[PDB]
């Protein structure tokens, strides 16, 4: 089902790990058998004659028992160690083979499969899910088997050693079963309700953080923060219920558990008075069933973890066995070896699976003779790069055919097909290696003569003899240490060391100077001698050296010919002619709530009670042994009635104090979670638009920040305080009594307590070291994989997946060696742990026999001390591992404490800055030099000047995104210019009160949004800080020509346009934006492309409404419709961020 990828050695590993899992699991019950016999000899000899001052038989028997104990210790040492290692070794080996095969089948996975899903989903899937499988199949299975072992061994040693008492005990089990089971049903249902309610109230942060920009313009912080608080104050009503219910149930569980104790002790006191089951054989059944219970109880999550393992492994195996359409790895392909450069098309239709609601191919009918060069032209929006992608078959068209010499496209072995052609594209990307190595990846095996000859001939050798480390410089992440035009020249050097039979040239000459373009042109010209080359047209001044020239109008051969053949042919060509996360303290995570100190006080007093409950049961147990020495029945049985009651009194008091500690800290936690949620959100909204425009602080990650990390902080705040308090009581009076009683046994056993305790600590230290080194090696290989999940299309183009596969393996072999070290590191301390629990028995009891014989302390005292300390430490272990992960919520608190203090340079809350009373919309730019500090390499504005007068207009004509949106921003003061100044109304906008400035600049951006409110609530969002009269809405509702169609709707001002409001068109929700900008009576507009969904009339009506109040107040317009540009007051062009 899941262990396929297994050699034999894996199976031997697992099986020789399982048998010794069981032979470790069976190691306590045997221990209790011997404990029974030894306490029998002790109390027999003691009562039958106490000797505080012929007894050496006691010693003979106790040394015999010491051999038994330790010999048993050795047994568990070996079996523990082997269980751990062999299980985690089988884990490591199989997981390394898994990773490797998963990549090698993600590269074989087509681009349609890449068009479907996400590209961080994949890499995160890789990293996390492989760790998930690793921990799943890894070792939890070993521990689970030893759990079931100790269980069945506990019950069997019961029935074998005394059956009446075992039946008494095992009889009332089904009541504890019913109890903790309904505990589970209660708590689970309540968790579900709580989480569903939150995530119903956390889609608000995700719809007002997916759109940070429109908010931060229109001045919509506080409207949002309040849309959030209003929901957290719904969820508290269910938080509280869950608190009281879960903690009542927990108290019940302990009342019943202590009730069970009383029953058994009283019964198996009548059945010892009758001289039937002696103390030695009477304590055996008791403790063995106790151990059975505790182990089999404390290993449930080792089933949830296996379930996670399967749950992950499903999709991973689903992919490795997956097998695509035309395979990038199958050598099953009828590759010719000699062939012309014929490329004949016909009636090819092809649509996209990811985009099928727009026909992109419409039937192409072209011929390419062998060698003759056709040059392709066309306007913006037809799919040139698309067609190139097709030609090489990254897809399969619908109802047409391409061929080379009529030979089918389903013939060419894909390695042949994409190693025979070559393409330089818009931005051929460079991977993270040398120059010589990119070029070697050009083909794989070339010559240095080819190298320099291409390099030179590729117009691109001077910088090499200029570059630092001339031959081998490192073009790192996305070509930052370069010019522009060097990158296309180096791509051409790569593509020329390939010697293709068909060449493709796309927008590779966009930021060059003419001469280098002409060089590479003539170079590929003097290279084409029997082959074809297709080029996509940037400037129609160089196309002239073609055999034939082609244009497109919707994907069909529309205009075909040479220069003069088309110059009078009048189609399309003619019209185209002219991470520190600074650590935090503890004190700080606490100071995060010194406004619920009453709860902490109740809960920690109550906690110290609850936790100082063992030293009770130590002294109780001491007294039980004490009463059974001399033998006067009459008063014995009355004492034992007393002690059954005492257990009963502790069963009630335990209930109350458990329920308090639980409920109190539940309250404190819930409160602090609501406060940290609110505070962090409110702090998110107050950050300048850089921080949000990062690849790290996305909407996914921020929404996770809110919805889990807030929750997790409570771990480190409250529970860790309760837990320190508990263990201090659980093991402080332990040692205090045990010093009043054992002057010298106590020291000796204190000298072993740290091992049982610091299994976890030594493992945390060393496992943390190796987990760091691992995650580093994993992040190396993750780099190597992020590459071909980002730069996929290129890599399959060069067909050079198969080089990445081996490059990947080379690193994958890192973490596997990591695991093989972790095996031994983990196992030797685990075994000393489990191993050293027995050697303590041996030492302590043998030493106590020494003293008792010499006469230093009654046997009741050696049993006290030993129980108070050893069952002390063993209880400490379980307590601690009940907490929530403190390592994982002292970082979470760090990740919110860095989001709190981070001071934005543009404070969107500040109450300072020159407020101008009345505002004349005279906008001015002074050689503003601009670049996004995100991709900080291309200066978007290279010194720009613009100046508009009141009531007037500007309008920036040109090409798509040329540097035409950034102007829209540097007034809303999202970003600040790298250089340049935009002084407004005569004065410098780097001095105004930013909260004020955006209150005058109404904007209809390229893509208006409608929130999750009713329409009334939505437009009157157009102004905040003063509630909107219902007629104000209605007034603009007639202004932007929208009041009529409203009267058709169910709830005129009250219908709900949902999340994105899928109930709507493009021309109406765009129209609402005009309704929206106009309630503010905005001084200057910025009508960025309002008509990309505006129909004729919808715009042709509203332009009358756009301008009429725009009269007497400026506007910048950056759109694409000439018939608005013409009537404008002024004129500007933008070429590569420059005016001309």
């Amino acid at each position: 089902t899941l262990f396929r990828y297994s050699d034999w050695q894996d199976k031997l590993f697992m099986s020789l790990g399982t048998i010794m899992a069981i032979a470790h699991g069976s190691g306590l019950p045997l221990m209790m058998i011997v404990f029974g016999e030894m306490t029998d000899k002790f109390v027999d000899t003691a009562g039958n004659f106490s000797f505080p001052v012929p007894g050496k038989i006691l010693e003979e028997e106790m040394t015999r028992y010491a051999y038994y104990y330790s010999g048993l210790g050795a047994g568990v040492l070996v079996a523990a160690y082997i269980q751990v290692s062999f299980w985690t070794l089988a884990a490591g080996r199989q997981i390394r083979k898994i990773r490797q095969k998963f990549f090698h089948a993600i590269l074989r996975q087509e681009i349609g499969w890449f068009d479907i899903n996400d590209t961080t989903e994949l890499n995160t899937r890789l990293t996390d899910d492989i760790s998930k499988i690793s921990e799943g199949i890894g070792d939890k299975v070993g521990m689970f088997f030893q759990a079931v072992a100790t269980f069945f061994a506990g019950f069997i040693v019961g029935f074998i050693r005394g059956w009446k008492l075992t039946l008494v005990i095992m009889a009332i089990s089904p009541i504890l079963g019913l109890s903790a089971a309904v505990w589970a049903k209660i708590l689970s249902a309540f968790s579900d309700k709580e989480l569903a309610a939150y995530a119903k109230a956390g889609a608000v942060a995700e719809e007002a953080l997916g759109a940070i920009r429109t908010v931060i313009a229109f001045g919509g912080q506080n409207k949002e923060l309040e849309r959030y608080q209003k929901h957290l104050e719904n969820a508290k009503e269910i938080g509280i219920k869950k608190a009281i219910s879960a903690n009542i149930s927990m108290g019940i569980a302990f009342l019943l558990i202590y009730a069970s104790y009383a029953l058994a002790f009283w019964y198996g006191s009548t059945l010892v008075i009758s001289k039937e089951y002696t103390i030695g054989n009477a304590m055996t059944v008791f403790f063995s069933i106790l151990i059975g219970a505790f182990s089999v109880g404390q290993a449930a999550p080792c089933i949830d973890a296996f379930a996670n393992a399967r749950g992950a492994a499903y999709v991973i195996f689903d992919i490795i066995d997956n097998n695509p359409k035309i395979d990038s790895f199958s050598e099953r392909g009828h590759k010719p070896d000699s062939i012309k450069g014929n490329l004949e098309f016909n009636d090819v239709h092809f649509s996209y699976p990811s985009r099928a609601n727009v026909k992109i191919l419409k039937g192409l009918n072209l011929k390419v003779q062998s060698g003759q060069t056709v040059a392709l032209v066309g306007s913006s929006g037809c799919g040139k790069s698309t067609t190139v992608q097709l030609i090489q078959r990254l897809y399969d068209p619908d109802e047409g055919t391409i061929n080379i010499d009529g030979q089918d496209i389903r013939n060419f072995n894909v390695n042949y097909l994409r190693e025979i052609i070559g393409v330089v594209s818009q931005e051929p990307v460079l991977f993270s290696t040398t120059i010589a190595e990119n070029i070697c990846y050009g083909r794989g095996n070339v010559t240095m003569d080819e190298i320099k000859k291409a390099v030179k001939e590729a117009n691109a050798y001077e910088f090499i003899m200029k570059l630092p480390q001339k031959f081998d410089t490192l073009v790192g992440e996305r070509g930052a240490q370069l010019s522009g035009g060097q990158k296309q020249r180096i791509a051409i050097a790569r593509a020329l060391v390939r010697n293709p039979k068909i060449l493709l040239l796309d927008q590779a000459t966009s930021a060059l100077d003419t001469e280098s373009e002409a060089e590479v042109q003539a170079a590929l010209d003097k290279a084409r001698e029997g082959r074809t080359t297709i080029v996509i047209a940037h400037r129609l001044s160089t196309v002239r050296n073609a055999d034939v020239i082609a244009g497109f109008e919707d994907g069909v051969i529309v205009e075909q010919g040479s220069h003069s053949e088309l110059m009078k042919k009048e189609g399309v060509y003619f019209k185209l002619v002219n991470a520190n996360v600074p650590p935090v303290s503890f004190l700080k995570v606490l100071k995060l709530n010194k406004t619920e100190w009453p709860y902490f006080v109740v809960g920690t007093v109550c906690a110290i009670a609850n936790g100082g409950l063992q030293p009770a049961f130590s002294v109780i147990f001491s007294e039980i042994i004490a009463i059974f020495g001399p033998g006067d029945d009459a008063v014995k049985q009355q004492k034992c009635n007393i002690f059954s009651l005492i257990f009963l009194f502790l069963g009630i008091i335990s209930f109350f104090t458990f329920f308090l500690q639980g409920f109190t800290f539940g309250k404190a936690g819930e409160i602090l979670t609501r406060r940290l949620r609110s505070m962090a959100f409110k702090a998110m909204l107050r950050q300048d638009m850089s921080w949000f425009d990062d690849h790290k602080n996305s909407t996914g990650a921020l929404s996770t920040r809110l919805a889990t990390d807030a929750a997790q902080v409570q771990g480190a705040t409250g529970t860790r305080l309760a837990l320190i308090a508990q263990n201090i009581a659980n093991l402080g009076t332990g040692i205090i009594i045990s010093f009043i009683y054992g002057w010298q046994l106590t020291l000796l056993l204190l000298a072993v307590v740290p091992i049982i305790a610091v299994s976890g600590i030594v493992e945390m230290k060393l496992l943390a070291g190796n987990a760091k080194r691992d995650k580093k090696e994993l992040e190396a290989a993750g780099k190597i994989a992020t590459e071909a999940i980002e730069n996929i299309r290129t890599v399959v183009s060069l067909t050079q997946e198969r080089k990445f596969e081996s490059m990947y393996v080379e690193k994958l072999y890192g973490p596997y060696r990591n695991s093989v070290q972790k095996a031994h590191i983990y196992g030797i301390t685990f075994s000393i742990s489990q191993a050293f629990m027995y050697f303590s028995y041996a030492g302590c009891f043998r030493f106590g026999a020494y003293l008792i014989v010499n006469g230093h302390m009654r046997f009741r005292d050696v049993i006290l001390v030993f129980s108070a300390i050893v069952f002390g430490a063993v209880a400490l272990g379980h307590a601690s591992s009940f907490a929530p992960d403190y390592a994982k919520a002292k970082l979470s608190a760090a990740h919110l404490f860095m989001l709190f203090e981070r001071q934005p340079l543009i404070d969107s809350y500040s109450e300072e800055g020159l407020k101008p009373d009345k505002f004349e919309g005279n906008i001015t730019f002074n050689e503003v030099v601009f670049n996004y500090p995100t991709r900080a390499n291309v200066p978007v504005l290279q010194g720009l000047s613009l100046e508009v007068k009141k009531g007037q207009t500007l309008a920036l004509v040109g090409s798509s995104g040329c540097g035409k949106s950034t102007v829209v921003q540097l007034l809303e003061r999202f970003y600040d210019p790298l250089a340049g100044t935009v002084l407004l109304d005569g004065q410098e906008a780097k001095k105004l009160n930013v909260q004020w400035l955006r209150a005058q600049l109404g904007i209809v951006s390229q893509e208006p949004i409608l929130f999750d409110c009713s329409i009334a609530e939505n437009i009157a969002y157009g102004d905040n800080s003063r509630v909107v009269s219902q007629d104000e809405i209605v007034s603009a509702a007639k202004a932007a020509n929208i009041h009529p169609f409203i009267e058709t709707l169910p709830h005129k001002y009250e219908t709900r346009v949902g999340d994105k409001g899928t109930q709507l068109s493009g021309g109406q929700k765009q129209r609402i934006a005009i309704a929206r900008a106009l309630i503010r009576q905005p001084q200057i507009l910025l009508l960025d492309q309002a008509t990309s969904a505006l129909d004729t009339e919808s715009e042709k009506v509203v332009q009358e409404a756009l301008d009429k109040a725009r009269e007497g107040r400026t506007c910048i317009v950056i759109a694409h419709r000439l018939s608005t540009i013409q009537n404008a007051d002024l004129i500007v062009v933008f070429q590569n961020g420059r005016v001309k």
Partner: antibody, heavy 131, light 107 residues
Amino acid sequence: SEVQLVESGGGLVQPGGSLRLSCAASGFNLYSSYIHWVRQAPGKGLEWVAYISSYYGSTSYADSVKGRFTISADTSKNTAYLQMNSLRAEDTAVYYCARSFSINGSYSWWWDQAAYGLDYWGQGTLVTVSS
Amino acid sequence: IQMTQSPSSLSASVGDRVTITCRASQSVSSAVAWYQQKPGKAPKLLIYSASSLYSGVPSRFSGSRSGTDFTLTISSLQPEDFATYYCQQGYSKLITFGQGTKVEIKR
């Protein structure tokens, strides 16, 4: 590197004004040690003003400024702000930043906050309070 | 928590025993310091805790404690001296630099 504390801001205000003085450290991590704000009188003497420790979240002002000034310590870019409100005429002094000492070398503990002295300083920005 | 550099504005000549007393408030208890500042430029740290020098500092400067009568004394007086020294004390969230002294050359 070598310990390099610089300042910023400051340069003009009248009585009844705000200001922000930004002490940017360079050469060490901020949250490892304490940070103070001395104020050198124009010609008279040298008087402490405040401090903040960003690893136990503990701030503390001298009397003459309490409630009015606010410190903060942005550990996303190694910066220590001091925001000032309602400046009088007895505050035209110059305002050096400073870093209190640590003995261990790479962090400072809570016990004896800055009782070993202040070692590294910046060069003061001069501020004024004239009408 | 008040500090008094008692012999303000000293007047000693080059090559002599030179003294400074900086009597504190009650019980700072060895947590005082001694800073020497040349005019206009930031103050230096000279010695701390009243006994033990900093780094890079010459070994001609003596720090002495007695109860709460402190003392910073000199005998070398290389003319790189002649500035103003301030003996800050630091205790319980309250730090006070006291009003220091100076050293005038003789003529």
